[PDB]
Design an enzyme around this catalytic site. Sequence first.
Site, mmCIF file in Angstrom:
data_model
loop_
_atom_site.group_PDB
_atom_site.id
_atom_site.type_symbol
_atom_site.label_atom_id
_atom_site.label_comp_id
_atom_site.label_asym_id
_atom_site.label_seq_id
_atom_site.Cartn_x
_atom_site.Cartn_y
_atom_site.Cartn_z
ATOM 1 N N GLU A 19 0.802 -1.220 0.000
ATOM 2 C CA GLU A 19 0.000 0.000 0.000
ATOM 3 C C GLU A 19 0.835 1.270 0.000
ATOM 4 O OE1 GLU A 19 -2.653 1.784 0.114
ATOM 5 O OE2 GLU A 19 -4.385 0.779 1.045
ATOM 6 N N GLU A 35 0.315 -5.509 6.380
ATOM 7 C CA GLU A 35 -0.039 -6.853 6.821
ATOM 8 C C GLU A 35 1.081 -7.756 7.333
ATOM 9 O OE1 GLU A 35 -3.145 -8.712 4.313
ATOM 10 O OE2 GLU A 35 -3.561 -6.686 3.572
ATOM 11 N N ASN A 118 -5.911 5.427 7.518
ATOM 12 C CA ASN A 118 -5.609 4.611 6.338
ATOM 13 C C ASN A 118 -4.908 5.345 5.171
ATOM 14 O OD1 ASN A 118 -6.333 3.284 3.614
ATOM 15 N ND2 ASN A 118 -6.594 1.618 5.093
ATOM 16 N N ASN A 173 -11.662 5.452 2.922
ATOM 17 C CA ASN A 173 -10.393 4.910 2.467
ATOM 18 C C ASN A 173 -9.525 5.908 1.713
ATOM 19 O OD1 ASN A 173 -8.433 3.070 1.682
ATOM 20 N ND2 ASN A 173 -9.933 1.411 1.465
ATOM 21 N N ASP A 227 -10.478 2.110 -3.324
ATOM 22 C CA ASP A 227 -9.423 2.097 -2.324
ATOM 23 C C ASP A 227 -8.649 3.408 -2.477
ATOM 24 O OD1 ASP A 227 -7.283 1.656 -0.626
ATOM 25 O OD2 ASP A 227 -7.246 -0.487 -1.013
ATOM 26 N N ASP A 230 -5.855 9.238 -7.067
ATOM 27 C CA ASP A 230 -5.002 10.385 -7.385
ATOM 28 C C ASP A 230 -5.503 11.041 -8.658
ATOM 29 O OD1 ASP A 230 -2.833 11.025 -5.540
ATOM 30 O OD2 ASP A 230 -1.903 9.123 -6.091
ATOM 31 N N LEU A 271 -2.253 3.781 -5.797
ATOM 32 C CA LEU A 271 -1.407 4.180 -6.899
ATOM 33 C C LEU A 271 -0.717 5.521 -6.676
ATOM 34 C CD1 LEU A 271 -3.208 6.449 -8.345
ATOM 35 C CD2 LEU A 271 -4.348 4.531 -9.460
ATOM 36 N N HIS A 272 0.247 5.823 -7.537
ATOM 37 C CA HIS A 272 0.991 7.066 -7.435
ATOM 38 C C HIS A 272 1.740 7.296 -8.735
ATOM 39 C CE1 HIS A 272 1.624 10.035 -4.326
ATOM 40 N NE2 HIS A 272 2.859 10.227 -4.759
ATOM 41 N N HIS A 285 -3.312 -6.430 -4.077
ATOM 42 C CA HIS A 285 -3.350 -7.462 -3.057
ATOM 43 C C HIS A 285 -3.662 -8.874 -3.513
ATOM 44 C CE1 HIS A 285 -4.204 -4.015 0.014
ATOM 45 N NE2 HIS A 285 -3.062 -3.869 -0.636
HETATM 46 CA CA LIG Z 1 -1.067 8.054 -4.415
HETATM 47 CA CA LIG Z 2 -6.174 2.381 1.340
#
Ligand SMILES: [Ca+2]
Ligand SMILES: [Ca+2]
EC number: 3.8.2.2
Length: 312
Positions: A19, A35, A118, A173, A227, A230, A271-272, A285
Amino acid sequence: IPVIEPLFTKVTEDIPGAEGPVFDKNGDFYIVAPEVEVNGKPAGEILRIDLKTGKKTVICKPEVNGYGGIPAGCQCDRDANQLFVADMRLGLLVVQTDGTFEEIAKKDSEGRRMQGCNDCAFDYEGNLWITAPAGEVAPADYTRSMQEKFGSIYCFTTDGQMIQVDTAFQFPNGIAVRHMNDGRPYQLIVAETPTKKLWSYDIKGPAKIENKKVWGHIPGTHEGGADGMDFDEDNNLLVANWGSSHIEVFGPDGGQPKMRIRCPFEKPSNLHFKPQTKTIFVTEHENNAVWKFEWQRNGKKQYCETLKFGIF
Ligand SMILES: [Ca+2]
Ligand SMILES: [Ca+2]
């Protein structure tokens, strides 16, 4: 609804709950592994990834008074090369690139115990908007708002106040801030995972939001939902739709997706964009891995990319 299938390239793998992908001011890439466990107890890690080899390095394994963390989201600061990390057990942390970390707050401005966080997003004024789907932090027994509506939203202002701006969400989220062309924060977009909705608020100032509205609808009946998210340079919002095998693309006005990106995995999480490029890094995941693909345009500049002493 048009769907595209770009080529996804594997970057690294074996990262439990991969994440919070982020780039720092130096161009270094980080991701979190919420996790990771040890003897059934949380032992989440913050890793640095070498993009040339995919080799991982754990720079921090957060723990406060014997309670391990569940780091899940990140943002890079502007005035200092440091990461702000939303932790599901510890709340909000500030992590240095050398691995040292500091706990930001145990309670909010109203004296209430902090909730586990989160994800987060900076606005161009330096305020940090945060989602809190967990119950109270660390010493408290771990709980999450997947079934009941106790998720909250916070704003950590530039003057260091931790203000709860809203509550009663069912697993808030992803989160993003829409800015005007002049760079002024305009709207706050919040993902409410299991309800398949994206909500928006008009931003009137630091920690001041109004006019809550249903901004967009996430497709599918599958278990999961929006989730991480961006914006791209044209203010299109890319949203990881966990469990649907797709990343949805919303236009500036919201509503229904205008396009969908098909992924070679069922669980995209976050994402990024790589600064000054069309490259998007995605965590997922299904395989607990990090991939990358080319988008149609560059990403929207992150707060860490802006200039404090800029003329224009
Ligand atoms: Ca991001
Ligand atoms: Ca998240």
